[PDB]
Design a protein around this ligand. Sequence first.
Ligand SMILES: *OP(=O)(O)OC[C@@H](O)[C@@H](O)[C@@H](O)Cn1c2nc(=O)[nH]c(=O)c-2nc2cc(C)c(C)cc21
Lengths: 529, 107
Amino acid sequence: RWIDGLQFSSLLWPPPRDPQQHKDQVVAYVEYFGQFTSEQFPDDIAELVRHQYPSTEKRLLDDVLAMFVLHHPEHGHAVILPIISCLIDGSLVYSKEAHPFASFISLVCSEQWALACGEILRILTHYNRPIYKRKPLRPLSPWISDILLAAPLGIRSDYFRWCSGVMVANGAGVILSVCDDEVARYETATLTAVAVPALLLPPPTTSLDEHLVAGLPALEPYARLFHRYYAIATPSATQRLLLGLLEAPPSWAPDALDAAVQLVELLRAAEDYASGVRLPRNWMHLHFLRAIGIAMSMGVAADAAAALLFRILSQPALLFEATIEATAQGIASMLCAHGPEVEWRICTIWEAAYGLPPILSWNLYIPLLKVLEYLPRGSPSEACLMKIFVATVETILSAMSELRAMVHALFLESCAGVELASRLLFVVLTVCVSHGPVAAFDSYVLAAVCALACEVQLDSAISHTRRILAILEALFSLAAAMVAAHISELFRRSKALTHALSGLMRCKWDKEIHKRASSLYNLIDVHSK
Amino acid sequence: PCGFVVSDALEPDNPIIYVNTVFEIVTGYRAEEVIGRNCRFLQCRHPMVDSTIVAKMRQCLENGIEFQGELLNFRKDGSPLMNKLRLVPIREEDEITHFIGVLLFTD
Ligand SMILES: *OP(=O)(O)OC[C@@H](O)[C@@H](O)[C@@H](O)Cn1c2nc(=O)[nH]c(=O)c-2nc2cc(C)c(C)cc21
């Protein structure tokens, strides 16, 4: 009956421009509406909304609808849902200035106000599951955004706490879809800026009851969010972010370390498919390694970052072109800068990490080479990587014969460093004699030297000979005099090596190869006996 | 352009130790995958590669004699080539410690 009555009122004609008549009039209709609230009321307004919408003029009906929800959140359901259904239908296109929505955005921008506001978002969340009726989308994602956008920071933070389930549509689904709509239609990312602290960090202590009972959510769905936040977050902010998660109470996280590591997994995984926001080239070092060290440099907060590196280095997938250099270069830099005291710890955490746990293989050490190149001269860090080196070699000695390929790599692969490889191979040989395996090293040299010596005499091929001569030429120079005795004994008890050197001596096709070959030879002669 | 390869005849099935740069670039098999493996694999077997010519190698390999012959071998791409291999036993005291294969690929 009553819908039919207000059909010709000033309810459907533009709001009187007078503020006083605007207010007095709206105050009158909100009480007329609210007088009923019968069983029929949802069914009643439903007929009223579909019949009267949409129009393009601004009307006083928007403001009565918007206010009635505010003064009677109990019946926000009966008011918003008819609009929700038409938004799903396509009857209503959603524009932030489309006129049912113009005012619901406006009431949100006072405890009465908060609850009404809350329930509006709590309703729109549940109906926001994806539909297809040109991708399939979430129909009410953008409206949630503009309401959440035009709102105090206090409720945004509490929306994401409620939505993700920190304390019907997928909770993870909406947060991602409303954070994207802001990025999609607006050109900024402020909702994802409040959402990432909202998930990782506990409620503030000042909010006590909530704080005491809250749990870190499942971080698997919000893997893009963290990538997008970390793609933009100033480096100081992420170290604020990480520490907060690191020094949180245990009721928050089963194992905060498992979750700090889990976060890393997801940005790395989302790095392969994320579009529009690219992580920095030092993102592993910048947002993590920079911070994780300083924690050690600066009470018990330092103690927990130490558990992360043991975690980081007991799962060596961080090392898994330029990302590797930067990742490796970064590991080197966090070592140097922080101080002698922390280096000794970092290095002893590393040792405890590598089973001195993961197995040890030459393939494990290929990445640490790129770290070791950047290390300085004689530091304990260099000693530590060389100590883990010996550990690797000891272990391989203990069928597939990874050893035979290893020596090929240091000798010739350029993985790199003739300086290192001379030093590295020296260690390699010294371990084999301790334990056969020494024949392997003895055997490879002749094979490489003689095959390359034959190829040259009969661009890349000449380049490798030079390197092998220098590696061997230097093995004499750097039990340093002792390995020297072995090489000279190796060369002149085999007639094949004997010949190959001689032709290399006399090769002028390449200037530097025969300057080099001559010197190695004379070094063989003296250390022969 | 000759590709080179070496085997340690002192081990079982003569596993590879050295791979020439051109071999790495004309077989797709960089050194790391093939070292410790014998080169029995370049033909893999596959029915159409001549069964006799492969057996003539292994017989020739035992007594330690040079073998020159020609099979078709293919990159892991599946794209096939053929080369004339020269297998050169090397010895000193005089036990065959090493082998050297000098193969000249031709598609
Ligand atoms: O058991 P089977 O009869 O199959 O053995 C014969 C050969 O197939 C095998 O044993 C190797 O000795 C052959 N071989 C090559 N075979 C190829 O098909 N392509 C190559 O390029 C090969 N290079 C080789 C190089 C060397 C040094 C040896 C010893 C063998 C070899």
